[model samples]
Target: SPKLPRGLRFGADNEILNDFQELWFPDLFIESSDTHPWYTLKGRVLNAHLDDRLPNVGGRQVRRTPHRVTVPIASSGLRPVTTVQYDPAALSFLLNARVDWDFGNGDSANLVINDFLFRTFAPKEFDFSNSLVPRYTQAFSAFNAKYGTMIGEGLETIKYLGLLLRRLREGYRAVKRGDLRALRRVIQSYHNGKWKPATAGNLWLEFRYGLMPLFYDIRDVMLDWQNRHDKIQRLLRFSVGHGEDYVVEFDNLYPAVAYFKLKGEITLERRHRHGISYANREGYAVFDNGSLRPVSDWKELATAFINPHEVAWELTPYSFVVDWFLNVGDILAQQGQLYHNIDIVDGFDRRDIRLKSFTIKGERNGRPVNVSASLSAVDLFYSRLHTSNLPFATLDLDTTFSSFKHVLDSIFLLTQRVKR
Candidate 1:
């Protein structure tokens, strides 16, 4: 899908000029422009079909309202039949389509999934674009930014029967960054009723761990963005599939996937215990001037996945167990035995892998994303999968992590900053 550039950002330019003759009207964007003084953005359901077939995979039946069924797809040496067991199971989801949209400035975009296809979450080979990095990043960013919002709006209306857009949660606790509070009081300090100086009030609040500490919590989440973005860009590497792939591109990557299994061994020793332990490896491919290949080696793969320097971990005692308190949402308390902020760094091992049902849980524009998979009964290395069998699989975004509330919270925060 061609992401209409930011220059074409919607709602960002809802009102415009025709030859410097500005106009504003409730024009529901759908025309050819100049001749029609408008642009067209239409949706059409293509090749839509209601399946009347077996809702079973690998001889196991699925019983859900929206049923899952094995279906035939366009491909060579592949069929949705018992002969090619994994092939049918792998083609579990494929809603095909095609569409055309032309902008007023002669720019246009077309979408198409109507095609011949083979299946793979399994990996037999690697193939993709080198530019897939920034391209996919920007694309997915726009995906959630524009497309995700519209869809979420639709679902919200559908879910509530067109009442309101109630996203995420209403409220639990709203946090205030006290540093900003203190700064505001200091900057705009001349209050009429200041028998006790504003400076004195701030000091009293600070000494009591009021304004400053709360700021720490907000800054805690805020400063964390550095590592968060790091993790995001790093994960984008995997999402940026392989290229110049010895002439065969699966066009799909495996999901075995994403997370580390958190494997380890510990003994009953009070202060000392150990055993060999490692995380299950997810398959990955590297690109350079070499042939396409999977990084089956755990250590080598770890380098691609988790950056060493970004890893942060620690342990601290809970001294004043909720002892100290500040009136932050009904008296915040500080008491804890152990505290560690871990984000995608491990102190163990890697390298065992599987393509069976590969998945990627990453960020779309630095927010949570769901990268999901495919295929192969036997991989190129000639091993059979107990899950999905396509040796090489595809990576697809589900918009599973909604940004509805994200925009809502961010909107108020940034908008208020503008007011200030």
Candidate 2:
């Protein structure tokens, strides 16, 4: 009989099995230049004014959110499996790889299984450097230059200046104090065209709603701030994982993991402005030597597998495993059980679908591994008003890898049994 593969061995007595899981955020944060900080100005603006109120301050840190969750495992009895965690910052997702199976004093058999939980959503890269800030700022500065002083003078002209300053003051206060609610109200006003009179329609309406060109500037800044900050709260859980290899290095300081878990609420939010949004369904890239490469072409995939420095590369066997899952996932979607939103727009009226449960059965190293998954529907929505490159789907995975070949052998056995 063929012996079990030794490369998959882990835990005491070499009993544990390998497992991998991932959560994808398709259209999440702004795409930054990994090679250079050419877009640092935009990054600085988009990331500014909100850091002070961020839940996890000072680089990467993981703390528990106020929620309860139960983690499930199979009946083969528990063994001390070594847990590996990876957190990718530039890309959005958290990966946990560990050993979950144990068979004591049992005959070694050829069997292996891999499970992946992929949440396909859109991602975005912003170029706010040429955004509305310049136009809005220029108009505001010019107005202020003409009539900024002389408040409470009781003259008609003085009253006009006072009103303009008061309008500016409300927006300024919201920005300085980080008042999101106040700012959102301002956004709603402009979005509904309530502030159109600021261009010279009616002074009465302009003063009532504090509608100045400068106010729109303040409103724009505020809306962008809320959009960025709120998502952090919903998506913060995705930034955490376990394992020594996933530690991200920044400014020569490697942040540490404070807490990690398999279950919690994964939140996704929508923006007020909607247009054509794009998503990278491949949220994670393969690890190439000490670097990372996106899974787009064969060259990158080759780098992920073939490392010349190590004579016997362990990950090569698992290199195409994820690709296998994607293929199987496509089959599941054909049955109308799994949902996928590729770059396909119906052309006439744009529409897409969603998913719930998925299952795959396969053999690794001649052993049987069964993969099952669940998705969140509330997180997926249809919006014609607003569009994003961020994917709107979410998934959770529960996997089982058995040491008893009979458990998986029965699958083939039944197929053969029926053929007769």
Candidate 3:
């Protein structure tokens, strides 16, 4: 198995480049080359306290925001992947070769997978380098971004197949030498005897030259990208230019887990009349390190995994009612007429009441992403409207809260059933 880096974890659920980091940001940072030709900028906005509020001196209130941007990368030294095809008629199999090409820019023609021939096209002065070089570069970029850490999976597949092919070829030579015992050893070594090939070339696996080059080429591309990503992260930390620093230095930092849990109790009380509580002794340690090692019970993780609405309605409200009803049911029920009439429920009642207000709804989240389908080009001009830190941080929260509230209000407004 591949060893993971320090301060990193892997998950099948979120397999993006930042998957390992989770709630913790990488300590190391890198800045982009200022001299690069094509720059793409991405960043976020953050809320920062002003420096002027100290009691020693009357301070001016200064507000800070976070931003992240992707810088443009442009240089003259990079080239795209190039391909040449071999035609049996126009080029000899070993003495001559013809070539076709696929640049990453959607234009692709294929040549033989791994055939090499010593053939040259017309000797006329022809500047063929201009044709496919640019497109190849674009393709490399797309492949790097999409595949990320697994960039070489396909290439590794091809290489592994090649190794097996060589092993098979070696077996044939041993057989030709009348080394039956050696052939038996080879069969035992690979279990190839089970799929005994009927002919010399019948070995199921064969080596292909196509896409093998990508394995060699992809490493350099990732290195270059990693170099850029690290540098930008560091520079953005200090530049005070945009809010990207928040993502690197602040957002990944978990809020005080103990305090947050306490606040959640308060929030639960405000939203629902129950004194609900949550514990975070172990979670606090994990948040500080982004490691799951501290958690004692794997089952407890479901609390954090609940959808927003389920959290507010099911977890919070149900916990409050259950805990408070059990502990203080006698006194509170007498004074406030609370749990005296309450029937003891073993677990949360998730079954819908078929009441007038609440119903299940669908959302795009948790659904699979559509990679093969076409998409409309998003118009990003209105993105500039989010000038403040509030929008980015609160948008997701508002959606969940509003949806929950709508369900509650609809049901509560029809309290005819509850009163009965």
Q: What is the C-alpha lDDT of each candidate?
A: 0.23, 0.26, 0.23
lDDT of 3 by residue, 1-420 (tens): 135433233335432122222212223232222211221112111222222211111111212112221111111111111111111111111101112333345433322111111111111111222333333344334533554444244324323333432443344445445565455445554333455442554121211111123323333332343344223222111101111000001011111111111000000000101011111112211232222122222122222222223333333533432332232222211212110121111111010000011111111123211111111111000011111111111112222122323332332222212110
Which number leads on lDDT?
2
User: What range of 10 consecutive residues in model 2 has the weakest lDDT sum?
Assistant: 37-46
lDDT tens digits, residue span 1-420, model 2: 024332222323443332211111112232222221111000111113211111112122211111111111111111111211221232222212221222335422221111212223322222222333343344334533343232111122322322433444454345445564565455455555543222433322333344344444433443332233233222211111111111211121111121112222333332212122111122111211112112232223223222335332234322232342233223212211101222311111122222323223323334543322233332133222112222321221111111112222332232222210
Write the residue-wise lDDT of candidate 1 on 30-97 in tens digits: 21111111112222223223222211112311111111222111110011111111112222222122
Q: Identify the leading candidate in terms of TM-score.
A: 1
Error of 2 at 231 (Å): 37
Instruction: Give me the runs in candidate 3 sitting further than 4 Å from their true place.
Output: 1-143, 190-420
Q: Estimate each model's TM-score.
A: 0.18, 0.14, 0.15
For model 2, give the RMSD to the true fold.
35.5
